[PDB]
Design a protein around this ligand. Structure first.
Ligand code: CL
Ligand code: CL
Ligand code: CL
Ligand code: MG
Ligand code: MG
Ligand code: MG
Ligand code: MG
Ligand code: MG
Ligand code: MG
Ligand code: MG
Ligand code: MG
Ligand code: MG
Ligand code: MG
Ligand code: MG
Ligand code: NA
Ligand code: NA
Ligand code: NA
Ligand code: NA
Ligand code: NA
Ligand code: NA
Ligand code: NA
Ligand code: NA
Ligand code: NA
Ligand code: NA
Ligand code: NA
Ligand code: NA
Ligand code: NA
Ligand code: NA
Ligand code: NA
Ligand code: NA
Ligand code: NA
Ligand code: NA
Ligand code: SR
Ligand code: SR
Ligand code: SR
Ligand code: SR
Ligand code: SR
Ligand code: SR
Ligand code: SR
Ligand code: SR
Ligand code: SR
Ligand code: SR
Ligand code: SR
Ligand code: SR
Ligand code: SR
Ligand code: SR
Ligand code: SR
Ligand code: SR
Ligand code: SR
Ligand code: SR
Ligand code: SR
Lengths: 115, 119, 246, 145
RNA sequence: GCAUGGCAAGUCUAACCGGAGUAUCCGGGGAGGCACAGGGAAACCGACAUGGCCGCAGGGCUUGCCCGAGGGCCGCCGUC
RNA sequence: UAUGCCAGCUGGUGGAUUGCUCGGCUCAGGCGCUGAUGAAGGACGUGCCAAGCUGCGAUAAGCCAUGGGGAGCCGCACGGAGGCGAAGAACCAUGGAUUUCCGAAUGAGAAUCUCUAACAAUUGCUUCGCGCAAUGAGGAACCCCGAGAACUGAAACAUCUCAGUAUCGGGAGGAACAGAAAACGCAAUGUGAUGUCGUUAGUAACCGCGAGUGAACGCGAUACAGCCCAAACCGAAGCCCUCACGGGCAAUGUGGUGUCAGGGCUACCUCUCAUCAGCCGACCGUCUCGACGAAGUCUCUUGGAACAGAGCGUGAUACAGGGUGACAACCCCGUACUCGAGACCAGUACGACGUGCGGUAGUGCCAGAGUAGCGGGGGUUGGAUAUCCCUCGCGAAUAACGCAGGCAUCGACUGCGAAGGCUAAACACAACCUGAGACCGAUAGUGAACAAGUAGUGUGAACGAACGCUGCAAAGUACCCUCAGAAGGGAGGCGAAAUAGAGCAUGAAAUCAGUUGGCGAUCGAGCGACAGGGCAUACAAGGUCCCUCGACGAAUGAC
């Protein structure tokens, strides 16, 4: 019983993509977002920096926060980013919405889930 | 106030001098132009035309004005009792229109013709 | 985007950039939350007399007279909730907090979101407003503030193919229920919202269902009456600009 | 629909036998009654322990870990840049209502730093120097002897 | 506790102040609270932005083999 | 088929339900003292007819003046009679007149009356005479000073808790109380009267260290304001009453000076805008009250009535609310705009009069005693060694001194001058006024929409109900018949409706009369559920059902 209309559409789009393309991540991410908010991911930059690798889109089934330092040049796809998170990321890489990610990579390939 | 109870209250309990406004009636087109007012306090001298009830269409002289009940008696506007006697059927002034005034009172006429105030 | 400006004759007279806020994603849940809060916050505290039903030394006779142990006085039952003339068990209480809190950020987000719903002709139409226009909201020259007569605003609205909404709101409803006994006999549709800059339009305010506001303090309710986003609005050249930094 | 809203007709409203929900007997006494007898379980144990020093003879240090400082070096552009130089006192929030500022050594230091503070931990120093940096003790900081 | 929603290494204002469409509402107010370090009665001291091994989901590949967030088992670090 | 069962029909009984609201409930803003010049309260009177309520007071629902108001009026209360009003009544506002008796109740006494000039009683002044004055009692709560429980919690109970609560005694005001540091003690190169609000904080502290109790400094705010004596040094330079004359007070000190930016004194510099006293005296704002105030009462149809439907038209700085024979911006009152008056803010702010701020040097001249402090015994508090107070006993210094900074003593350091006093504003309450409502809607909401603290109960303290609705208009039923009949009945008249005819909108159930269907005087009791037959059935809102035969034909399955 999610209340945010945009969250609902995102979740529906994620499913559409997983059922129609060579991707299982999107379906997976859809399932985690359907779970209660308290289980949603809250990841700071330090964690992305530690497990991300270039040319592998980092996918966060939640929201990205701005503690720590990101140096790698990666593309991070998340439900949302804090103002600072989005700022630090864009400086050395790129911040993208799961909505954009699903459109550029419906098959959801070369992607790494981080929480 | 905006509360219905208080509105009806202030009306039913208004002191006598404040009840004149409860017996006012609209003026004919001519009179409105003549005295620059839209209506007036019906007097026992005026002539009036009934515009609404079962007596709509009848005109007559106002024979009485009761401030206690805020109603008026108009000549010929009556009901026939059981014994055959004829009695007046009281009318609310808002259902009436003044077509002729009784200006025998200097004060009333002055008030009517004055501009700052109305009668 | 770009918004077309109109002069008091209803003729195009240039245009300006529709401020960014009008592109805020529409959030009906946040808007609904904001309205729900404003509506709750003006409600008055009430409750029954705390001693109602307790003004009596009534006592129970206990066992012995073949009667239920009910407090009685002068052979009449009293005080207890099951007794006629007895106290109310769990009545309305004055001490109850009837207000709703709302983080400033969450409320401000709703205002911007309600603002953005004003620029979507489809939403505005779905909300219910009647108009024969394509561009929305309606932006007019600041001379609008100098208008005085209500009918002058009528002409401008007719010339703007927007007067139909006022006709929609030109019908009151006499509500079902006892609200009438408390002064709430009527209610009527919400028509056009006029947002000016210096002071609310006295010339437009009496229009059926119309509301007037100022860019500095226009809130979620006038932008989305009842919490339903997409009100047919008419901004003022400068009002449009001031609203940009809300 | 809520749980409360579904109780009409149930008689006992989830209380079990209608003889249960009466007075405090149903709670074994009011408040923390029995915390040493029938309901001793999971209660802190009885007794006194320790002492307290008077509040106006107590010091409250304002601390900060090198990690915090170091991760925001560039961001702290509004502060010295040498061969960076930073007065921790001008960094730590709550630095006013504190008796002194102390730098702790939690985390890493990926820059050469010259830190000015009222006090440092053994580890904070070993780290700041180890990365080709230095540590400067304030005048107040000169209260170590 | 839980569900939903905002913001996030921060978050929220309280009284109260100005405005106004005047109990709503718009702006202001961060006092102070909780979180951002712990341990110790106290004096006082003051920590893993990752070192190892398993491995779910997911990803990759030449289809068993790599990468493996979260999680699991350890090391190691602060303090008594 | 009698007595009778079940369901319905017509008519009752009853007053549920629906709709309605002259009353409640709660919130908000404003405002806020009365009384010996006899209050508040009560009694008894007072009307053409007058029992209750309201008003009033032997001038008795009222008298007078000024302003408003206006052609009507003679309260609730819609009768009869009579009267008043253009000599401007009614009505409203302001001011005045009258204002019985009891009542603080005050000449004495008394269940509202009586007996023979009255501040009774206690005080101050005093012309020592009640000559001039004060006190007394009331008020919804709020406020200040005293007295002070228990049920209860601790699952018993004693300290503790409930709680300085309930209740009692005394007392002031519109608000009270507090208040210009012998403070604080984020210890400082720091803050700077006092309430209050938010926080500090369920922190420190207390406690059969149990249950529980529980601050402060500070900070952010609100509002802001600071002064006067005692003494030193002067020593009648003074005060009160009276028009005056004159009297009284006052050396046991009136008055000047002065008040920790210490002061006085002696010697100087300079200067006053501090303070204090008095004079004048608002704007604005807020609350209430009032004046003014736009635009349809057009056509047709329905209706008893148009405020309905359809058609045409209009105002709006006014589309809040109410009224009017039904859904009304435009019929009436109002509403927006504009304007006026009173009250509060406030005798405040500003302004002006007078006074005169301050600084140097010298001077042990002055600066509040059963006090500060200690001990015994109690209460109280978070106050723990370190709260505040009462009581018994003891008891200091003199600024070169003294108190404080959370155990005691001594030194240092920092703060500050007790034992005299006054003080605006910001805050509490809700009687009174006005406004408001996701509150109740007549077994509700007040006990009280009505005769309501009424009727009624009790020796008394005290206790205490129930009762709302004709109709558009009374048109509130003429005449006739019947009857012992102003009864009731019949017939009749009115109205859209009397199945609206008086507790008179609607009119449920229980239940009663009459009656329709089904059953019924040879038969058995949780009153039914499910199947199946009889009998009964206006329409509408359900339209299916039966028999031959044929098609399909699961498990099962023959003669
Ligand atoms: Cl993280
Ligand atoms: Cl401690
Ligand atoms: Cl301080
Ligand atoms: Mg005129
Ligand atoms: Mg009751
Ligand atoms: Mg209803
Ligand atoms: Mg006497
Ligand atoms: Mg006990
Ligand atoms: Mg006690
Ligand atoms: Mg015990
Ligand atoms: Mg206590
Ligand atoms: Mg303190
Ligand atoms: Mg009642
Ligand atoms: Mg009836
Ligand atoms: Na009572
Ligand atoms: Na409340
Ligand atoms: Na029970
Ligand atoms: Na501070
Ligand atoms: Na803060
Ligand atoms: Na008052
Ligand atoms: Na009478
Ligand atoms: Na009198
Ligand atoms: Na006297
Ligand atoms: Na005397
Ligand atoms: Na017990
Ligand atoms: Na016991
Ligand atoms: Na105890
Ligand atoms: Na009318
Ligand atoms: Na003592
Ligand atoms: Na001190
Ligand atoms: Na009743
Ligand atoms: Na049958
Ligand atoms: Sr009358
Ligand atoms: Sr009357
Ligand atoms: Sr017994
Ligand atoms: Sr339960
Ligand atoms: Sr009980
Ligand atoms: Sr328990
Ligand atoms: Sr035990
Ligand atoms: Sr702070
Ligand atoms: Sr905030
Ligand atoms: Sr791990
Ligand atoms: Sr001050
Ligand atoms: Sr002194
Ligand atoms: Sr000490
Ligand atoms: Sr009743
Ligand atoms: Sr009541
Ligand atoms: Sr008795
Ligand atoms: Sr008849
Ligand atoms: Sr048997
Ligand atoms: Sr077969």
């Amino acid at each position: 019983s999610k209340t945010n209309p945009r969250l609902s559409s995102l979740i529906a789009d994620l499913k559409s993509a997983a059922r129609s393309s060579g991707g299982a991540v999107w379906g997976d991410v859809a399932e985690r977002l359907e779970k209660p908010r308290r289980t949603h991911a809250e990841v700071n930059l330090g964690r992305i920096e530690r497990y991300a690798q270039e040319d592998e889109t980092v996918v966060v089934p939640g929201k990205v926060l701005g503690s720590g330092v990101l140096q790698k040049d990666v593309t991070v796809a998340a439900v949302d980013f804090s103002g600072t998170a989005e700022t630090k990321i864009d400086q050395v890489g790129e911040a993208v919405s799961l909505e954009q990610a699903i459109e550029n990579n419906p098959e959801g390939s070369h992607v790494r889930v981080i929480r | 106030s905006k509360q219905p109870d208080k509105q009806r209250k202030s009306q039913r309990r208004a002191p006598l001098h404040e009840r004149h406004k409860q017996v006012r009636a609209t003026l004919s087109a001519d009179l409105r132009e003549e005295y620059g007012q839209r209506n007036v306090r019906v007097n026992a001298g005026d002539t009036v035309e009934v515009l609404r009830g079962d007596f709509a269409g009848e005109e007559g002289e106002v024979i009485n004005v009761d401030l206690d009940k805020a109603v008026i008696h108009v000549e010929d506007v009556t009901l026939e009792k059981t014994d055959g006697e004829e009695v007046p059927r009281p009318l609310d002034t808002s259902n009436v229109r003044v077509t002729d005034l009784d200006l025998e009172d200097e004060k009333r006429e002055a008030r009517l013709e004055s501009e700052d105030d109305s009668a | 985007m770009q918004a077309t400006i109109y002069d008091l004759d209803g003729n195009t007279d240039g245009e300006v950039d529709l401020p960014d806020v009008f592109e805020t994603p529409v959030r009906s849940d946040l808007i609904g939350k904001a309205v729900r809060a404003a509506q709750a916050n003006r409600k008055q505290d009430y409750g029954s007399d705390e001693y109602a039903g307790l003004r009596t030394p009534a006592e129970s006779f206990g066992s012995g007279r073949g009667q239920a142990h009910v407090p009685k006085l002068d052979g009449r039952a009293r005080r207890v909730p099951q007794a006629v003339k007895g106290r109310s068990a769990h009545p309305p209480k004055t001490e109850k907090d009837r207000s709703l809190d709302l983080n400033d950020k969450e409320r401000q987000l709703a205002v911007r979101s309600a603002l953005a719903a004003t620029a979507d002709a489809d939403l505005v139409a779905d909300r219910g407003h009647e108009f024969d226009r394509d561009e929305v909201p309606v932006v007019v020259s600041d001379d609008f503030e100098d208008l005085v007569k209500t009918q002058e605003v009528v002409s401008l609205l007719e010339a703007l193919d927007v007067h139909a909404d006022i006709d929609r709101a030109d019908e009151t409803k006499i509500k079902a229920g006892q609200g009438s006994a408390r002064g709430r006999k009527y209610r009527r549709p919400a028509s056009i919202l006029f947002v000016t800059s210096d002071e609310p339009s006295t010339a437009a305010r009496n229009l059926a269902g119309a509301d007037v506001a100022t860019a500095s303090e226009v809130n979620t309710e006038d932008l989305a009456p009842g919490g339903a986003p997409g009100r047919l609005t008419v901004f003022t050249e400068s009002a449009l600009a001031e609203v940009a930094e809300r | 629909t809520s749980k409360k809203k579904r109780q009409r007709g149930s008689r006992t409203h989830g209380g079990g036998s209608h003889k249960n929900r009466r007075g405090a007997g149903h709670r074994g006494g009011r408040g923390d009654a029995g915390r040493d007898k029938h309901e001793f379980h999971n209660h802190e144990p009885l007794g006194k322990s320790g002492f307290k020093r008077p509040q106006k003879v107590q010091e409250e240090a304002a601390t900060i870990d090198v990690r915090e400082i170091d991760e925001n070096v560039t961001l702290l552009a509004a502060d010295d840049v040498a061969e960076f130089r930073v007065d921790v006192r001008d960094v730590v929030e709550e630095a006013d209502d504190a008796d002194y500022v102390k730098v702790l050594g939690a985390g890493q230091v990926r820059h050469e730093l010259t830190l000015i503070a009222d006090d440092f931990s053994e580890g904070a120093r070993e780290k700041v120097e180890g990365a080709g940096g230095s540590v400067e003790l304030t005048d107040l900081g000169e209260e170590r002897q």
